[model samples]
Target: MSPIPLPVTDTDDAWRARIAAHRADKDEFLATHDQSPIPPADRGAFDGLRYFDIDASFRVAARYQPARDPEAVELETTRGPPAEYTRAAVLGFDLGDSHHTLTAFRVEGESSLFVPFTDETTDDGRTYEHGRYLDVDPAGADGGDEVALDFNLAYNPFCAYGGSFSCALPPADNHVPAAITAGERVDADLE
Candidate 1:
């Protein structure tokens, strides 16, 4: 499969606008789309989604080291059978003077990177217990040379909304022993 291009912007503000657009699109789906994970009983009360404060520090350029022997690894899901993903790369970065690394994966083809990570906030009633995900296009990242890994854009899986969606759980190795204070938060009102 070929890589599908994502909308690009030169500045942080523009990228933020793009994020806002994405959120608006999700909101539209939640309120009106037939496949919204949001329960119908809560649509009338749904105001909007909540997100972490966008902090520039959360955006970092990570050193991407390609996996030596790329192969499929199975990860358990919320309600489905285990899913297979190829270990793509090891992404390394620093935040708050603490260096961190996560194993990124190739979901479909080698066009992009999917990072499923579990932070300190996960399972603490602050975010989804199964954790959040980050999607990075390898084409935009200099082919895994210096990928821009943005924690601020991390998002809860559709399973976070309700049981109708079964999302994959982050692998144990992807767990980071840090409190990531950026990204979409667990909705306190989810029911």
Candidate 2:
């Protein structure tokens, strides 16, 4: 019954605590909240979620490149009209020796960065076939404002759960060229 702590100092223990808390809240929501993807009839049978083991290095700081009076990027959505967001920045980071970049976005009226992406792991069912998401801070243009890119926290959009919710769809360009094996997995029992 660990609680997910708010942001903390950079440390292994701090990250673990945050993950534990996040898991706890997620379980709580699925078990009791109406917004859960799990149907009410299946709540009791609901087991906790599955995730890859926590690797400290999985969390890394990214270089943020703010977009210039950027044009809106339109994304296809099952829920409605194309989801519109301003191209916020180019988040550059490394996975081992290979370097990669993903486009970050700011949905209209939203302040934080909405990073919806996919990876090679999607080919298998390790992650959602469509993609996963990470909500990060909009860092400065200096590339030193340090926005954490933690694959362990990446999540599938609500739209993956069922038909009730309309989640923002991931853009094709946000697909990473590497295999990101961390973060949530589809519950086996649900399969």
Candidate 3:
């Protein structure tokens, strides 16, 4: 008997559907959930979060390199002192002709890795001024060296909603000079 095939994520249509579903879920939560960053007074007018067109080109295959001995990283927050996280891994990828690398950090006791980054979009008022974030699974840390860095799934940090929440700022290494036009956009009212 043949084994069941795994889910395909590389295709354009399948990737689009996945991103759409994720956005819908996020919108629902932001509009109704108590823990949502969107202020309750603004929830009534919140139709959905804005996002750039999902382009397949934004999804790139990257080489994942885990740190031999992870170091603790202190990230400055929008408020308060700072948040402590461990530098877990680094992802090296290319956009156009230029090579870029992003460091993935892990909160103590958490299983996923967090990558906060900024691009040309931020300067143009296309996205959040501070940065956008992407959470990656470290399952590939074992034997797999290649991982998909889907910029289409990148999103604005919670602090983008307002001053009510404190968020970590993207470090110098995470800043990509090229334009990453995918993912969430800035909400003028919130900004």
Clashes of each: 0, 1, 0
Better of 1 and 2 by lDDT: 1
Give the range of the ten consecutive residues with the poorest summed lDDT in model 1. Answer: 1-10
Candidate 1: Cα lDDT at 3: 36
Candidate 2 structure quality by residue, lDDT tens digits, 58-149: 77778666776667877766677877777787788887547878888886776657787877776566577666777665633434444678
lDDT of 2: 0.67
Q: 1 or 2, which is superior by TM-score?
A: 1
> What are the per-residue Cα lDDT tens digits for candidate 1 across 155-186?
77776665356566776877777777788888
| RMSD (Cα, Å) of model 3 | 3.9
Query: Which is the better candidate, 2 or 3, if ranked by lDDT?
Result: 3
Comparison by TM-score, 1 against 3, better one:
3
Model 2 bad stretches (over 4 Å): 1-9, 107-112, 139-144, 187-191
TM-score on alpha carbons, each prediction: 0.81, 0.77, 0.83
Say which candidate scores most in TM-score: 3
Candidate 1 Cα errors over 4 Å, as ranges: 1-9, 109-112, 140-144, 187-191
Model 2 deviation from the true structure expressed as Cα RMSD, one decimal place: 5.7
Top lDDT hit: 3
